[PDB]
Amino acid sequence: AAKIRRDDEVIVLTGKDKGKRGKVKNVLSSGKVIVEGINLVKKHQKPVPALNQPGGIVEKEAAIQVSNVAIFNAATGKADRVGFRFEDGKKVRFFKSNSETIK
Amino acid sequence: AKKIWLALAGLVLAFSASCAQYEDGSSGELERQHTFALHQRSISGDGDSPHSYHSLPEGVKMTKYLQEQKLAVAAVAAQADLELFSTPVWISQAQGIRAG
Amino acid sequence: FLIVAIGLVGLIMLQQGKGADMGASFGAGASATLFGSSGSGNFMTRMTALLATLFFIISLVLGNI
Amino acid sequence: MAKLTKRMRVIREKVDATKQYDINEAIALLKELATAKFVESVDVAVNLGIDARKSDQNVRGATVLPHGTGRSVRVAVFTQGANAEAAKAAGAELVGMEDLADQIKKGEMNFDVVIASPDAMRVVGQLGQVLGPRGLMPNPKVGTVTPNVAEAVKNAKAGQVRYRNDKNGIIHTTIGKVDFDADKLKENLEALLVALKKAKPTQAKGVYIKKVSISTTMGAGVAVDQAGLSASVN
Amino acid sequence: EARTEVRKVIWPTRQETLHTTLIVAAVTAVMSLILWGLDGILVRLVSFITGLRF
Amino acid sequence: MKAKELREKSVEELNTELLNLLREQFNLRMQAASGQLQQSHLLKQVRRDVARVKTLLNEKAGA
Amino acid sequence: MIREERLLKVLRAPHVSEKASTAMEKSNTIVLKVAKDATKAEIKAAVQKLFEVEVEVVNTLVVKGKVKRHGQRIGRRSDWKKAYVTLKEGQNLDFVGGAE
Amino acid sequence: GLDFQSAKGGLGELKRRLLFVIGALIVFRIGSFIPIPGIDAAVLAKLLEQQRGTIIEMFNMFCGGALSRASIFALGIMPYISASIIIQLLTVVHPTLAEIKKEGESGRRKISQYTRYGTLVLAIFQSIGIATGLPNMPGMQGLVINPGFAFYFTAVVSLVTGTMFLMWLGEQITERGIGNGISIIIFAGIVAGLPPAIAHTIEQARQGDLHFLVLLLVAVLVFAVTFFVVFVERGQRRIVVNYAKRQQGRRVYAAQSTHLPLKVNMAGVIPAIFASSIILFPATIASWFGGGTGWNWLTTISLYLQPGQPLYVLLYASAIIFFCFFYTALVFNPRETADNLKKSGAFVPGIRPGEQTAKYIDKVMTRLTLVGALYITFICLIPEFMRDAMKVPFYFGGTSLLIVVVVIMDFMAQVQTLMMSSQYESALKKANLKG
RNA sequence: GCGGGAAUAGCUCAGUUGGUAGAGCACGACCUUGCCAAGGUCGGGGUCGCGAGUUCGAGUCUCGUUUCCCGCUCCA
RNA sequence: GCCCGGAUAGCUCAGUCGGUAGAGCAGGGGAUUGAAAAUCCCCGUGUCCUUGGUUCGAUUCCGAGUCCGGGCACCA
RNA sequence: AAGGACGUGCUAAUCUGCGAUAAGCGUCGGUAAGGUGAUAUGAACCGUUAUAACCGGCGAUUU
RNA sequence: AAGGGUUCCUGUCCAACGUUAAUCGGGGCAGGGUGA
RNA sequence: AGGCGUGAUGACGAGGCACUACGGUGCUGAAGCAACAAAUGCCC
RNA sequence: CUGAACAUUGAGCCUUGAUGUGUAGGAUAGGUGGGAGGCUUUGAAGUGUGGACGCCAGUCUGCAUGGAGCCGACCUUGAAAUACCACCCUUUAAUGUUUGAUGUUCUAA
């Protein structure tokens, strides 16, 4: 099914990054997403279209898996699928991870 | 140095070392000889500064240089093909001996 | 005589502007099309300059014969 | 063989001659080929449809004719000279063992009726092979009016003419003299045509009365018309 | 043709917009503030001078 | 796509595609290829739109 | 009509840059990349009906592409045709030719 | 970009600088009225403003009104520019000397220390020349000082004294405020112009008349001219063709990336003025001479032109259009940027360097310069058409716009060229740990 | 050194389980003819290469030997 | 180099049952003739190629040896 | 037709897909909050739950 | 001509490729070019 | 086939006159006929 | 696939004539049945021709003359005996033929 949104809340299941959260900037067609501030690596960047534009070792978002992150519900960090079991003529999301029944 | 060069052109065009039009013509009034008005001015330039709290600019002008690596060969010359040869060599024998 | 008197002071006055100009001001006070020391701060040096502007008006009246 | 003499010549010159005429016309012609003033053997050559010759598909037998042959009736006995029905119930001229055997089989005889008795007939068929034109040999049936050999020899002494087959199936039987009369001839002819019909050999091919020819000696002959079942319908 | 050739080139050439021009406008206002100022003080100083020498 | 095709009418659509191709794509593709009006997004449209009109004609003789 | 819009689909890019393509537009002729149409008559009638350019001799020449000598499979640039269309009137100053 | 200016205004640092500047301009206006012991600033200021016919316009453009409406001295900024020029000769000769100058912090100190010494020698020579000259042509000078032994002695000394004072003045201001300093003086000149003009708009007001119509048109006009000059100037024809292909891949394709545009679709404000000054100048030189009694013949030729294409307006106008067009086409010389581009390596995209690259590069510049020529004329025309129904103007017409533009563009360019860097650095240091 | 051939009338030349073993010419005697040819008749002769073995019987079959002859060692 | 054969009274040659060697042509003599050819008869000279051996006796049997004639590889 | 040749994109080689209506087009449905296949992902843009894109039936075009 | 198929020319770059070195070349890089 | 009119009062042309940024361009122009000797080619 | 007439010629039943000679039989034995006998008046025979053999002394008969009567020795040998009357095949002739051969002529395949 799915667990993706373009604003999704996570509690982060990635080690060294647990207990953190962030919007999902963009969803990638690689099973990956970009969560705020936790995929930052220092990147030896060489200017391209080279101008004033800074080189240095710049903080640059990588991307981690969606299965190596876990959702945040609304009071709990539990993840065990989000229900798409209800059809209003189209599948609608709700929590069944902690059963708080909201998208 | 670039700025000075602009200054020089402005001065030159004065064709009188700046304003130095002798008094007379029709209006009276003693004559002067002036300073050297003008400006200077800048021009591509430099600037930028992602500052502004609510704004953002870019650049303009420059160049580049890449020499990267071209590597392949020789490696990319022994796998992308094959120089097989059967080596055709004939060794005509020599008989005629009488072993009877 | 009036015209002479201003002049003596003016020359003393100049020496003073320069003295001010080098320390706070930057040793580029005159024409230098860059800059690198004033703007940050309030100093002594602004006042010498202020004086100079003011001074020019003073000189003629006095001088006036 | 055949003579140039007038009575012989006219038939002899013709190819496919001896053609069939009614019995009265036949006998009327036959008389006139000669002048009566001598004996001459009148024969019948009755032609059976068998083409069987010198074989055991010959028809041979013997019938009692109510009259004599053309040279006056004389008898010579083929015997074994220790007979039982040819030397003891009909007798013979002499009891010859082969004193009489020779005479039959010799072919020069002054006896007309060649009597046969056993000398072998259970191993000799109806065969014409190296038998005599004048002589003969017992055959499986020697009679055709008696189906007994013993009684046949009896019959032969009474006055039986023993007749046997040819190349063309010809049963030659001496009918009489020329000094016979038309009717005396008729009686004999009838005795022989009826005899062949009565019985025949069953060790041979059948009978059937084809051409009946009648001839006298020195002249030729002409033949009598036949239906082949009766000489009294044709 | 010579004037025109120059025009014909202009119409393509004009690019690299100053959608910025509101900055230039904002600067114009700042340039204006100054003018107002020279005139005011000139009346104050001039006034002091008018009593002494006028 | 949807409503575009559906509101087309034979007489109309015929003369509309002439405009599409010539003097709305004809100019564009030449300018763009020399960098004098190269905007890549405009190339993607027009091309995949003039196509549509011709479809209806050979399918069912216009909408 | 004399021709359809698909016989006026014949130009997809001009040639207006570098040697013998700026030089041979200023001094003589005009030059444009003419798809791969394989016609000369309809290219004359292209610049009649569209534009308003008048021409002299129209010259047709096949261009067989040029190598890309780094492989992968076949490589090489695609075929096209170059045509010297040749002005007789117009005298166009680039990105003009007519259109009403 | 708009967003960018606005931000600065909020922060403390700018506000202090902006405040200072309004003060700075004032200091200059005040100074101008009150005289000089050497020539006499107030008398000089008036005369210049008046009329003068042909003579006034030529003098006025180059000046910008700077001290042609606000006259004081007869030396100051010119010695700084002269001195600055000698150092430029010195820099060229010796590479090492140039290097220090380029680095901004080092560079600035050097220039003044050298300039003050130079300026003093130089100035005495200029002053003596100026002093002899000034009395002779009218007969008379000043009214705090009058021609004679006394005027010569005072004049030399006074120009020199002034020159040094100004140099220090100019420096305090640049850092304290925004916009170069040399620029400020020029700017005051624009200000000096303004009341006569202002008085006339005030009179018109609203009333639903011709006068109402004109106010609305004038307000609009000032802005429009400003906008139109601006749009063209940035106006860039921007061709980016990457040199070779260099296989494919990386981004959309990794080629040697050459992005060249240096195009300015206008001709540039300093060039524009130049063409205009030059036509005027032979006549203007004559006119004074003629009056004195000297070079009578030179004046007579100037007068002759009026029987063809008449009116004082008509000769100048026609000539000025041709001249803008002419100047630009021929030469690429009095526009620095044009010269610089050519010298450094480059090649036109699609073209193989040789005769063909040289040809093409010149051609763009020849168009560009012609383009500029056209635009300047169009601004000037709009008043000329407008005025005949509306009312005659007198400060909202044509050779003034050119005067107004050069001072601004440059003042503005400088505030950016320091100002962006300054903020960036300031921000940066604090993050590091550094005041 | 090997393999196959023969030694028979003066001469040239048959035969042969081993039975009384032959021709043509020369030679002996005749005849035609003066006499010889040519022509014509009529005779003789054999250690049957030599010695044994086989046997009543050898030259041969069998075995040894003397003399006279051929064909081979191409091939290796 | 090897195997074979011949070596005769003047010239040319026969000569095995080893035991006393003859034939022819020259040549001489007699017969024939008128005298001769031819043809017939008679004549002796070989100490039967040297040297040993077997033998009572060998030219003739055996072993060498000579001179001459026969047949056979310089080298692959 | 199978199978090819040559084209075809935002541009550039090939690969992939597709044919001058050319990495698609229409129509009906499924599906959908993210997408514009790949080497090399960039550039420009598009859609955002309901009109893109993706998937299928049917049709068009199919050099 | 046949045949090759851009190898031509132009500017560049030199790791591999020309029997060497190699700034150079018909190599790499990309352009321009054959007009009836 | 080849020669002579005409095409052509033109082009081309030895060599000179100018300036240049040293890439190169502008300025000008004499004679232009006669005779003899040729090919495996041409008439063929 | 491929026919018609007519000409010529072996052989089978046959039909009508003339020899049918082995050995023995004097001579006339294809053969098979009748059979010791023919004088019928241009008629067999006899006298002469051809065919049969001359093997023990002979006669037969085609066919002409001829109204003009002979000889199997009315033997006997053998497997069978002769004239003559039916009548056979060969050698041969003519007919009816049946069949296999070739030829000739023709046109319809």
mmCIF file of N, CA and C in Angstrom, chain B residues 8-47:
data_model
loop_
_atom_site.group_PDB
_atom_site.id
_atom_site.type_symbol
_atom_site.label_atom_id
_atom_site.label_comp_id
_atom_site.label_asym_id
_atom_site.label_seq_id
_atom_site.Cartn_x
_atom_site.Cartn_y
_atom_site.Cartn_z
ATOM 1 N N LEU B 8 38.942 57.698 -16.392
ATOM 2 C CA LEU B 8 39.805 58.217 -17.442
ATOM 3 C C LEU B 8 39.115 58.669 -18.783
ATOM 4 N N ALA B 9 38.206 57.794 -19.310
ATOM 5 C CA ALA B 9 37.339 58.010 -20.433
ATOM 6 C C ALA B 9 36.444 59.238 -20.218
ATOM 7 N N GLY B 10 35.802 59.369 -19.010
ATOM 8 C CA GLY B 10 34.936 60.422 -18.693
ATOM 9 C C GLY B 10 35.627 61.754 -18.811
ATOM 10 N N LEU B 11 36.858 61.830 -18.186
ATOM 11 C CA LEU B 11 37.766 62.987 -18.207
ATOM 12 C C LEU B 11 38.191 63.457 -19.575
ATOM 13 N N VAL B 12 38.597 62.486 -20.414
ATOM 14 C CA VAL B 12 38.991 62.636 -21.755
ATOM 15 C C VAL B 12 37.941 63.303 -22.623
ATOM 16 N N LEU B 13 36.714 62.809 -22.489
ATOM 17 C CA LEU B 13 35.589 63.337 -23.252
ATOM 18 C C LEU B 13 35.359 64.814 -22.947
ATOM 19 N N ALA B 14 35.841 65.256 -21.790
ATOM 20 C CA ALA B 14 35.687 66.645 -21.377
ATOM 21 C C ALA B 14 36.210 67.601 -22.444
ATOM 22 N N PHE B 15 37.282 67.197 -23.119
ATOM 23 C CA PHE B 15 37.883 68.018 -24.164
ATOM 24 C C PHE B 15 37.979 69.476 -23.729
ATOM 25 N N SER B 16 38.401 69.692 -22.488
ATOM 26 C CA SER B 16 38.536 71.047 -21.943
ATOM 27 C C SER B 16 39.056 70.776 -20.508
ATOM 28 N N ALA B 17 39.431 69.486 -20.145
ATOM 29 C CA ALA B 17 39.897 69.166 -18.833
ATOM 30 C C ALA B 17 38.696 69.414 -17.918
ATOM 31 N N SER B 18 37.572 68.752 -18.145
ATOM 32 C CA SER B 18 36.363 69.156 -17.432
ATOM 33 C C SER B 18 35.724 70.457 -17.824
ATOM 34 N N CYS B 19 34.807 70.993 -17.026
ATOM 35 C CA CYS B 19 34.150 72.253 -17.352
ATOM 36 C C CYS B 19 35.119 73.425 -17.241
ATOM 37 N N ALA B 20 35.484 73.995 -18.386
ATOM 38 C CA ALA B 20 36.406 75.124 -18.419
ATOM 39 C C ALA B 20 36.017 76.119 -19.509
ATOM 40 N N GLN B 21 34.716 76.326 -19.677
ATOM 41 C CA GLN B 21 34.212 77.251 -20.686
ATOM 42 C C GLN B 21 34.401 78.700 -20.249
ATOM 43 N N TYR B 22 35.328 79.394 -20.903
ATOM 44 C CA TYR B 22 35.607 80.789 -20.585
ATOM 45 C C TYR B 22 34.318 81.593 -20.460
ATOM 46 N N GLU B 23 34.107 82.903 -19.183
ATOM 47 C CA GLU B 23 32.893 83.735 -19.104
ATOM 48 C C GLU B 23 32.568 84.531 -20.390
ATOM 49 N N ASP B 24 31.282 84.656 -20.703
ATOM 50 C CA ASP B 24 30.850 85.385 -21.889
ATOM 51 C C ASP B 24 29.739 84.640 -22.622
ATOM 52 N N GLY B 25 29.306 85.194 -23.749
ATOM 53 C CA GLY B 25 28.253 84.586 -24.542
ATOM 54 C C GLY B 25 26.960 85.377 -24.491
ATOM 55 N N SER B 26 26.326 85.389 -23.323
ATOM 56 C CA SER B 26 25.072 86.111 -23.141
ATOM 57 C C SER B 26 24.434 85.776 -21.796
ATOM 58 N N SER B 27 24.901 86.441 -20.744
ATOM 59 C CA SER B 27 24.377 86.216 -19.402
ATOM 60 C C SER B 27 25.323 86.768 -18.341
ATOM 61 N N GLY B 28 26.484 87.245 -18.780
ATOM 62 C CA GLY B 28 27.472 87.797 -17.873
ATOM 63 C C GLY B 28 27.795 86.863 -16.724
ATOM 64 N N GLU B 29 28.655 87.321 -15.820
ATOM 65 C CA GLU B 29 29.050 86.522 -14.666
ATOM 66 C C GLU B 29 30.477 86.004 -14.816
ATOM 67 N N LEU B 30 31.334 86.360 -13.865
ATOM 68 C CA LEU B 30 32.727 85.931 -13.889
ATOM 69 C C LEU B 30 32.850 84.481 -14.348
ATOM 70 N N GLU B 31 34.076 84.060 -14.641
ATOM 71 C CA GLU B 31 34.331 82.697 -15.090
ATOM 72 C C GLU B 31 35.060 81.890 -14.021
ATOM 73 N N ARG B 32 34.871 80.575 -14.049
ATOM 74 C CA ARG B 32 35.510 79.688 -13.084
ATOM 75 C C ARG B 32 36.525 78.775 -13.763
ATOM 76 N N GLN B 33 36.410 77.476 -13.506
ATOM 77 C CA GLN B 33 37.308 76.502 -14.090
ATOM 78 C C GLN B 33 36.974 75.067 -13.627
ATOM 79 N N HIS B 34 36.078 74.973 -12.605
ATOM 80 C CA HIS B 34 35.436 73.709 -12.118
ATOM 81 C C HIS B 34 36.347 72.690 -11.397
ATOM 82 N N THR B 35 35.810 71.664 -10.722
ATOM 83 C CA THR B 35 36.470 70.490 -10.228
ATOM 84 C C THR B 35 36.432 69.502 -11.264
ATOM 85 N N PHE B 36 36.151 68.266 -10.866
ATOM 86 C CA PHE B 36 36.074 67.156 -11.809
ATOM 87 C C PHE B 36 34.910 66.230 -11.476
ATOM 88 N N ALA B 37 33.694 66.699 -11.737
ATOM 89 C CA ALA B 37 32.496 65.913 -11.467
ATOM 90 C C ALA B 37 32.575 64.542 -12.129
ATOM 91 N N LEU B 38 31.462 63.816 -12.111
ATOM 92 C CA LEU B 38 31.403 62.487 -12.709
ATOM 93 C C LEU B 38 30.746 61.214 -12.187
ATOM 94 N N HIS B 39 31.390 60.577 -11.214
ATOM 95 C CA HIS B 39 30.870 59.347 -10.628
ATOM 96 C C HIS B 39 31.866 58.205 -10.457
ATOM 97 N N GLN B 40 31.816 57.241 -11.371
ATOM 98 C CA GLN B 40 32.721 56.099 -11.329
ATOM 99 C C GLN B 40 31.515 55.216 -11.637
ATOM 100 N N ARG B 41 31.244 54.262 -10.753
ATOM 101 C CA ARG B 41 30.117 53.353 -10.927
ATOM 102 C C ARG B 41 29.892 51.852 -10.781
ATOM 103 N N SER B 42 30.973 51.085 -10.859
ATOM 104 C CA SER B 42 30.894 49.634 -10.734
ATOM 105 C C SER B 42 30.628 48.867 -12.025
ATOM 106 N N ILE B 43 29.791 47.839 -11.934
ATOM 107 C CA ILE B 43 29.450 47.025 -13.095
ATOM 108 C C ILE B 43 29.974 45.600 -12.944
ATOM 109 N N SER B 44 29.157 44.630 -13.341
ATOM 110 C CA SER B 44 29.536 43.225 -13.254
ATOM 111 C C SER B 44 31.045 43.069 -13.100
ATOM 112 N N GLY B 45 31.529 43.220 -11.870
ATOM 113 C CA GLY B 45 30.665 43.517 -10.743
ATOM 114 C C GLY B 45 30.967 42.651 -9.535
ATOM 115 N N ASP B 46 29.915 42.164 -8.886
ATOM 116 C CA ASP B 46 30.066 41.318 -7.708
ATOM 117 C C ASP B 46 28.760 41.662 -6.997
ATOM 118 N N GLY B 47 28.531 41.030 -5.851
ATOM 119 C CA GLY B 47 27.326 41.266 -5.078
ATOM 120 C C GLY B 47 26.717 39.982 -4.549
#
